[PDB]
Amino acid sequence: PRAKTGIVRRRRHKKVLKRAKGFWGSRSKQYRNAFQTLLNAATYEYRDRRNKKRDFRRLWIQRINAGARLHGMNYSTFINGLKRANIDLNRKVLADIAAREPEAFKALVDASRNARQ
Amino acid sequence: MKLHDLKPTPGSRKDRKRVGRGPGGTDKTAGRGHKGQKSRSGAGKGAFFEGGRSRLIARLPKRGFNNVG
Amino acid sequence: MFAIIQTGGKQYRVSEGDVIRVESLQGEAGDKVELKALFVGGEQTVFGEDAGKYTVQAEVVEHGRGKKIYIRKYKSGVQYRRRTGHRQNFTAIKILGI
Amino acid sequence: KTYIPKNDEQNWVVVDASGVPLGRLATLIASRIRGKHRPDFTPNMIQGDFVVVINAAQVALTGKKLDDKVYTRYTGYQGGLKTETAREALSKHPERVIEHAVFGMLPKGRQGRAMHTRLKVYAGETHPHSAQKPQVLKTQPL
Amino acid sequence: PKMKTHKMAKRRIKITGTGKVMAFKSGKRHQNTGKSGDEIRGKGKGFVLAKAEWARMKLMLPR
RNA sequence: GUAGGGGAGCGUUCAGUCCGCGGAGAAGCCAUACCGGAAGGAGUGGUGGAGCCGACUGAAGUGCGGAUGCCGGCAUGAGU
RNA sequence: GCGAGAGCUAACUUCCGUAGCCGAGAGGGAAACAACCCAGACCAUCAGCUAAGGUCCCUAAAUGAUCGCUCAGUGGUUAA
RNA sequence: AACCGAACCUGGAGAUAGCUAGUUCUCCCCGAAAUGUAUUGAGGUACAGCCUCGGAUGUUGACCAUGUCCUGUAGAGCAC
RNA sequence: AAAGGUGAAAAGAACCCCGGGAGGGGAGUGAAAGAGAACCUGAAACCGUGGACUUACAAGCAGUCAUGGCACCUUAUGCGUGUUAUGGCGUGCCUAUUGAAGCAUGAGCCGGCGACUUAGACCUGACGUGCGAGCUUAAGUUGAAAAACGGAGGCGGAGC
Ligand SMILES: [Ca+2]
Ligand SMILES: [Ca+2]
Ligand SMILES: [Mg+2]
Ligand SMILES: [Mg+2]
Ligand SMILES: [Mg+2]
Ligand SMILES: [Mg+2]
Ligand SMILES: [Mg+2]
Ligand SMILES: [Mg+2]
Ligand SMILES: [Mg+2]
Ligand SMILES: [Mg+2]
Ligand SMILES: [Mg+2]
Ligand SMILES: [Mg+2]
Ligand SMILES: [Mg+2]
Ligand SMILES: [Mg+2]
Ligand SMILES: [Mg+2]
Ligand SMILES: [Mg+2]
Ligand SMILES: [Mg+2]
Ligand SMILES: [Mg+2]
Ligand SMILES: [Mg+2]
Ligand SMILES: [Mg+2]
Ligand SMILES: [Mg+2]
Ligand SMILES: [Mg+2]
Ligand SMILES: [Mg+2]
Ligand SMILES: [Mg+2]
Ligand SMILES: [Mg+2]
Ligand SMILES: [Mg+2]
Ligand SMILES: [Mg+2]
Ligand SMILES: [Mg+2]
Ligand SMILES: [Mg+2]
Ligand SMILES: [Mg+2]
Ligand SMILES: [Mg+2]
Ligand SMILES: [Mg+2]
Ligand SMILES: [Mg+2]
Ligand SMILES: [Mg+2]
Ligand SMILES: [Mg+2]
Ligand SMILES: [Mg+2]
Ligand SMILES: [Mg+2]
Ligand SMILES: [Mg+2]
Ligand SMILES: [Mg+2]
Ligand SMILES: [Mg+2]
Ligand SMILES: [Mg+2]
Ligand SMILES: [Mg+2]
Ligand SMILES: [Mg+2]
Ligand SMILES: [Mg+2]
Ligand SMILES: [Mg+2]
Ligand SMILES: [Mg+2]
Ligand SMILES: [Mg+2]
Ligand SMILES: [Mg+2]
Ligand SMILES: [Mg+2]
Ligand SMILES: [Mg+2]
Ligand SMILES: [Mg+2]
Ligand SMILES: [Mg+2]
Ligand SMILES: [Mg+2]
Ligand SMILES: [Mg+2]
Ligand SMILES: [Mg+2]
Ligand SMILES: [Mg+2]
Ligand SMILES: [Mg+2]
Ligand SMILES: [Mg+2]
Ligand SMILES: [Mg+2]
Ligand SMILES: [Mg+2]
Ligand SMILES: [Mg+2]
Ligand SMILES: [Mg+2]
Ligand SMILES: [Mg+2]
Ligand SMILES: [Mg+2]
Ligand SMILES: [Mg+2]
Ligand SMILES: [Mg+2]
Ligand SMILES: [Mg+2]
Ligand SMILES: [Mg+2]
Ligand SMILES: [Mg+2]
Ligand SMILES: [Mg+2]
Ligand SMILES: [Mg+2]
Numbered sequence A: 001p002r003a004k005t006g007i008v009r010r011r012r013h014k015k016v017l018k019r020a021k022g023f024w025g026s027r028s029k030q031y032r033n034a035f036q037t038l039l040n041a042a043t044y045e046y047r048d049r050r051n052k053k054r055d056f057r058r059l060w061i062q063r064i065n066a067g068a069r070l071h072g073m074n075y076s077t078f079i080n081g082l083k084r085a086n087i088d089l090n091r092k093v094l095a096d097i098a099a100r101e102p103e104a105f106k107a108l109v110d111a112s113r114n115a116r117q
Numbered sequence B: 001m002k003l004h005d006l007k008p009t010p011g012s013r014k015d016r017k018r019v020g021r022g023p024g025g026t027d028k029t030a031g032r033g034h035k036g037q038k039s040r041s042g043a044g045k046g047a048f049f050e051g052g053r054s055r056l057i058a059r060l061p062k063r064g065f066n067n068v069g
Numbered sequence C: 001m002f003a004i005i006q007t008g009g010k011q012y013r014v015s016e017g018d019v020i021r022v023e024s025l026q027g028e029a030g031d032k033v034e035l036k037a038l039f040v041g042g043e044q045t046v047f048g049e050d051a052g053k054y055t056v057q058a059e060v061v062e063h064g065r066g067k068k069i070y071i072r073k074y075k076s077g078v079q080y081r082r083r084t085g086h087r088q089n090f091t092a093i094k095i096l097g098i
Numbered sequence D: 001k002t003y004i005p006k007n008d009e010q011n012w013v014v015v016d017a018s019g020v021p022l023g024r025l026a027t028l029i030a031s032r033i034r035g036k037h038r039p040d041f042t043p044n045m046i047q048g049d050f051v052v053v054i055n056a057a058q059v060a061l062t063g064k065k066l067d068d069k070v071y072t073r074y075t076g077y078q079g080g081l082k083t084e085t086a087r088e089a090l091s092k093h094p095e096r097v098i099e100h101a102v103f104g105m106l107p108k109g110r111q112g113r114a115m116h117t118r119l120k121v122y123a124g125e126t127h128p129h130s131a132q133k134p135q136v137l138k139t140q141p142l
Numbered sequence E: 001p002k003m004k005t006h007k008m009a010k011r012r013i014k015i016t017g018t019g020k021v022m023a024f025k026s027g028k029r030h031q032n033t034g035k036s037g038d039e040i041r042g043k044g045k046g047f048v049l050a051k052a053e054w055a056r057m058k059l060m061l062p063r
Numbered sequence F: 001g002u003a004g005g006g007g008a009g010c011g012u013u014c015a016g017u018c019c020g021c022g023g024a025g026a027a028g029c030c031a032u033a034c035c036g037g038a039a040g041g042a043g044u045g046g047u048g049g050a051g052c053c054g055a056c057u058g059a060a061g062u063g064c065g066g067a068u069g070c071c072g073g074c075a076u077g078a079g080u
Numbered sequence G: 001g002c003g004a005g006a007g008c009u010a011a012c013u014u015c016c017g018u019a020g021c022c023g024a025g026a027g028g029g030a031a032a033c034a035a036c037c038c039a040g041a042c043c044a045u046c047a048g049c050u051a052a053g054g055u056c057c058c059u060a061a062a063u064g065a066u067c068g069c070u071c072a073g074u075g076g077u078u079a080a
Numbered sequence H: 001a002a003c004c005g006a007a008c009c010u011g012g013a014g015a016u017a018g019c020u021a022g023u024u025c026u027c028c029c030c031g032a033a034a035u036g037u038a039u040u041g042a043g044g045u046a047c048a049g050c051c052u053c054g055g056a057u058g059u060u061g062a063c064c065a066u067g068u069c070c071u072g073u074a075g076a077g078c079a080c
Numbered sequence I: 001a002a003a004g005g006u007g008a009a010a011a012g013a014a015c016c017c018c019g020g021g022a023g024g025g026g027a028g029u030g031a032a033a034g035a036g037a038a039c040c041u042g043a044a045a046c047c048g049u050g051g052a053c054u055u056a057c058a059a060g061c062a063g064u065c066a067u068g069g070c071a072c073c074u075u076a077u078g079c080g081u082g083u084u085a086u087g088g089c090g091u092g093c094c095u096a097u098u099g100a101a102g103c104a105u106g107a108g109c110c111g112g113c114g115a116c117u118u119a120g121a122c123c124u125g126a127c128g129u130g131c132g133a134g135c136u137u138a139a140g141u142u143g144a145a146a147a148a149c150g151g152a153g154g155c156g157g158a159g160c
Helices: A007-019 A031-070 A076-083 A094-100 A102-116 D024-034 D093-107 D110-118 E052-058
Strands: C038-041 C044-047 C058-065 C068-075 C080-086 C091-096 D012-016 D050-054 D119-121
Touching: A007 A031, A031 A076, A031 A094, A031 A102, A031 C068, A076 A102, A094 A102, A102 C044, C044 C068, D012 D024, D024 D050, D024 D093, D024 D110, D110 D119
Parallel strands: D012 D050, D050 D119
Antiparallel strands: C038 C044, C058 C091, C068 C080
């Protein structure tokens, strides 16, 4: 019994090719560059996911001291003074509190400063 | 009995090694190691310096009895 | 405003059905109790432990299984290419509490 | 999940460089351009302000406004580096010196080139952007 | 098929026993010898060790 | 985690047995946001116009990106 | 890196010993950078703490506090 | 008879090739070596050494402490 | 060397239209001309026409992740789909190597062909079955829509 490759290879190739949407040029049309681009793209997808965690970390922080200094203290002497205010621990995305309710972020500034005295 | 439902004893047939055929195992170089005289093959049980040649004490015949302990 | 502090469940203030990591006990009406970490009511803020005594009731809605991803991984010149599937379970919970 | 804003607003301010150390006036203006004073809201968008630098001519400089500050530009032609306008000389056109400092502290990508638009340097005491009434920043931080 | 390597047979390597490979003791054959009288005698019958698998298939049918 | 050893498996053709499907439409082809831990598998629609799926067992010419690999088609250089 | 020979007490030299790394080691730092510093990646999270290394703006984080030192851009290139 | 230090064709013939290149489906478990001897040996092999699988045994393994013996380097010294 | 296929049946397209023709458009036949003789299916590379979203201060292994914009709504109003602008990050693949983005090998692209096999009463192990102190046949004979018979001989059983 002979068992030629037919239908198998086209199906595999077409699944690779379909992963290529708006890939530029022969990235979208030739199988070999499509598959090769996907190897490097693997690298990027995994690394980036882990990194995106750390990137939103950064955006968080960068808003929080901007509001903090608007109230006359930096990030450092703030997220300290909430933690030194101990039970105050809300921590996760204080960014949004600073970015939408300033009546609240002002009270948190007063709390941190009271804790540092 | 159902021939659909015949089943060989588990463990009595194992599958052949399919050497080649992926990076899911046994990639590129087959079972083999890389370079070297491992390639289309030959040469037997021989070390190709000096094969432990010990001397020879010899007598050709024999004939032995059938045993009934 | 209200959001899971995605370490597990603890949160601030305001009521709206939302996703979370799985909650063990199922069906509905888990009524799962929630402990305040912040509140803004009447825009009258109360926070940290003082607010934490405040309750937040919330019923369980549905168990789920969020959208699929692939864990695919690659290294160079070494034949290291591996592909696997993954899918995270979750738990809708409808906010309701004080 | 995280809040991102409009683009709706543009806010102007005059910085007085008169007697300030350059370089420190530099980072002050560069941050007010980047948008780090309001919450950075989003990196993608230039939420930063328009800045008007007046009395740019009188910027102070320490150690050597001579001798030290050798600004340099390369021309594309062989022998085209020997273009080292340096020093006090560029305070014959002061608005560029300040404008160079700030530009080295904005990022080099497509936003930064666009952010260059938001710096408005006038060497004299006066500025003509009266129409967008800017009001003032000033000295130092905390 | 499968030959025995007849270089194994009347040569040392008796196959015999609990499956282990005896061999002889070698130096001072009938090449010249002054040397000791307690070595000229201690050349009777040795038995090798970590090569046996090679020796066996030289002569697995015990000729 | 490289050579290497071990484990469990996906898909292709052929064969035996079963369950069946097909001109009110089969394989093949084409699109797709569904499913499975992967190899993969289904749903629906378009095309086609005569054969074919699923399950269990068996046997293999059984899985390609490379080989200045082969055959064929078509491009670039260029309206030069 | 340490201990030695050969070498000019040269070499990203060569040859032994010894520990660690790369080889097959991703991640953070060292501008870039196999070997150096921190640390060994089962999968997911728009949660928290630290290590090396950092906290003027590119660029996450004290234009930090207290004593001094250097007015050379020393910092940011050897010596008799 | 358009390539003559030994023509062309067919055959042995799939010459031989310690040399180059290539060797394709998937996830899981473990995980090396570039050392030592020998070699018409040095980019090849044989046996060790390091990997894995299965069986047997069953802490015999690992650091660390105490006890005990062995040693002529660092340093030092000038008694050869 | 390459080699193939209208349709069940030639019923193989009278007649008309543009054209020297070639080619086509109708009318007819036929279930179908979505079969018309460059005659089953008709993938891919390659060439085009139309549409959506886009692009003429931009430095770029061609992606990836994040967010805004504009379309769209048949596994589909969502944790959607397509496409964009902008930020962050980001040194093709293989081979060969102490060490490859390498200015080191290979490759224009796509399709198909393309490499660990077979053999032998041969050795040596793992797993599984039958019979077990014993196990088994070879050549062949006779029967074959099927398999039985056939102890010659082979392996244990004694070693030095
Ligand atoms: Ca022309
Ligand atoms: Ca030309
Ligand atoms: Mg990345
Ligand atoms: Mg934080
Ligand atoms: Mg086999
Ligand atoms: Mg395997
Ligand atoms: Mg090779
Ligand atoms: Mg060969
Ligand atoms: Mg031989
Ligand atoms: Mg010799
Ligand atoms: Mg790479
Ligand atoms: Mg490598
Ligand atoms: Mg004997
Ligand atoms: Mg149909
Ligand atoms: Mg499909
Ligand atoms: Mg028909
Ligand atoms: Mg084959
Ligand atoms: Mg390959
Ligand atoms: Mg090819
Ligand atoms: Mg060709
Ligand atoms: Mg010397
Ligand atoms: Mg060296
Ligand atoms: Mg190597
Ligand atoms: Mg390592
Ligand atoms: Mg690393
Ligand atoms: Mg690194
Ligand atoms: Mg870096
Ligand atoms: Mg460096
Ligand atoms: Mg280096
Ligand atoms: Mg690396
Ligand atoms: Mg911390
Ligand atoms: Mg530290
Ligand atoms: Mg900062
Ligand atoms: Mg200071
Ligand atoms: Mg001639
Ligand atoms: Mg001719
Ligand atoms: Mg000749
Ligand atoms: Mg040949
Ligand atoms: Mg021959
Ligand atoms: Mg020869
Ligand atoms: Mg491991
Ligand atoms: Mg010797
Ligand atoms: Mg060697
Ligand atoms: Mg060995
Ligand atoms: Mg074991
Ligand atoms: Mg022991
Ligand atoms: Mg012990
Ligand atoms: Mg000394
Ligand atoms: Mg016909
Ligand atoms: Mg015509
Ligand atoms: Mg005509
Ligand atoms: Mg009709
Ligand atoms: Mg037609
Ligand atoms: Mg047709
Ligand atoms: Mg025609
Ligand atoms: Mg037909
Ligand atoms: Mg056709
Ligand atoms: Mg067109
Ligand atoms: Mg177009
Ligand atoms: Mg321009
Ligand atoms: Mg533009
Ligand atoms: Mg260009
Ligand atoms: Mg982009
Ligand atoms: Mg080299
Ligand atoms: Mg490199
Ligand atoms: Mg190149
Ligand atoms: Mg190259
Ligand atoms: Mg080479
Ligand atoms: Mg080339
Ligand atoms: Mg036999
Ligand atoms: Mg025979």
